[PDB]
């Protein structure tokens, strides 16, 4: 029904080295959908994504990603707006 969201880094995170932060989103009827990556709750500027979509059942598979250098204390999250959602869903990165 509503989108599935996973948030995870390309590697076991270590601080001061370069890794990638991924947001995988999947569901149905995506033409409208808006996905942001967040650092300390504010949008990350340069972010890329790859989209895969099928008309038969209107399924979609999106992957938003950014090269980032994690630290001890910087918090990172994914935000997703969709029609099915009355209010945007947030998923916090964990480790």
């Amino acid at each position, epitope marked *: 029904r509503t989108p599935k969201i996973q948030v995870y880094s390309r590697h076991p995170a270590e601080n001061g080295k370069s890794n990638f932060l991924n947001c995988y989103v999947s569901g149905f009827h995506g033409s409208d959908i808006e996905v942001d990556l*967040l*650092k*300390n*709750g*504010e*949008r*990350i500027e340069k972010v890329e994504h790859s989209d895969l979509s099928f008309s038969k059942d209107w399924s979609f598979y999106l992957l938003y990603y950014t090269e980032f250098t994690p*630290t001890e*204390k*910087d*918090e990172y*999250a994914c*935000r997703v707006n969709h029609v099915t959602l009355s*209010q*945007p869903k*947030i998923v916090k990165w964990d480790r």
Partner: nanobody
Amino acid sequence: QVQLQESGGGSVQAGGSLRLSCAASGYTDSRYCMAWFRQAPGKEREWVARINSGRDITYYADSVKGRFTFSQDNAKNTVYLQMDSLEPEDTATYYCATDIPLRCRDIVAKGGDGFRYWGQGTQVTVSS
């Protein structure tokens, strides 16, 4: 330029509730992130809470998690921090801090204090 509106402090019986309030005029597009610190007698400064400029992400100090919650007014101009289940240890002066999203992004969420624009502070006294 940026003017803080910060309020709500006073005296409360322990176990009671108290709503702090913050807003700021002067920001471009009224877009600004916001955090609360408090200073109590006998302790260092303590970070309490943080909300982002879009107002849909909140981080809280473990010390207040489950007790303190951000909300917004109907008009959306002001942000509230609802403090329930107050204990005497929460007696302190509370301050809010604001800055533009571009800077806020690099101000660490739990603890970061690099905000340019602060309130003078509102005092909360929790008696037994």
